[PDB]
Design a protein around this nucleic acid. Structure first.
Ligand code: ATP
Ligand code: MG
Ligand code: MG
Length: 153
RNA sequence: AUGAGGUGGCAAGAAAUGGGCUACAUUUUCUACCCCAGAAAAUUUAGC
């Protein structure tokens, strides 16, 4: 299995694991990723009966940045960009899985495009009459946020 | 007057058959895009 790596701990991946697939346990799948993974990667997980992510340079660089982050300075914005279907979503998922294992609090938005299109129950906020509420989109995210961060609640 | 005008009136129904016009969707429809997204829901006439 030249394409697999036995190191299933994202905190110990480096340049020597590049191009190799590491396994995410079903517990980690259901806890860390109720909603994150791309729709067509969930089919592969269901068909292969295992979730495996390749270790790539973008994720390695973004993990090296997060390992040396100073928590006293203001939060740094990292933006993954690339051509269509290049793996940036799964790189973000790799980074989320790294952060979850170190008892970070995860605020994961799986797709912000869903909040700006195709909303059937749009309401007007009682808090601020000039804004609109999206109960179906907010309650769906709240359940998965509770699932991911149940310990800290 | 087979020319030019005035006045009023003339409104039509039945089938049997032939044709024409419209919409007819899941391989569909709406939005973004111009193709890796999100939501909704037997007879018979021609042609190659
Ligand atoms: N690190 C990876 N490990 C395994 N498969 C991967 C990886 N990166 C990409 N893939 C494959 O590529 C497919 C698309 O990846 P992904 O959804 O991350 O793309 P993307 O660049 O975020 O796409 P888009 O521009 O459409 O948002 C994944 O479903 C998987 O098949
Ligand atoms: Mg993506
Ligand atoms: Mg008449």
């Amino acid at each position: 299995a030249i394409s697999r790596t036995n190191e299933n701990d994202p905190a110990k991946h480096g340049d020597q694991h590049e191009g190799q697939h590491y396994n995410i346990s079903p517990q980690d799948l259901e806890t860390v990723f109720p909603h994150g993974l791309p729709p067509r990667f969930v089919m592969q997980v269901k068909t292969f009966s295992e979730a495996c992510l390749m270790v790539r340079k973008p994720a390695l660089e973004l993990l090296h940045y997060l390992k040396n982050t100073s928590f006293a300075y203001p939060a740094i914005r990292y933006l993954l960009y690339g051509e269509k279907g290049t793996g940036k979503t799964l790189s973000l998922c790799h980074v989320i899985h790294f952060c979850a294992k170190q008892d970070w609090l995860i605020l994961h938005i799986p797709d912000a495009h869903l909040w700006v299109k195709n909303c059937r129950d749009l309401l007007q906020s009682s808090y601020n009459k000039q804004r609109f509420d999206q109960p179906l989109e907010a309650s769906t995210w709240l359940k998965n946020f509770k699932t991911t961060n149940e310990r800290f609640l």
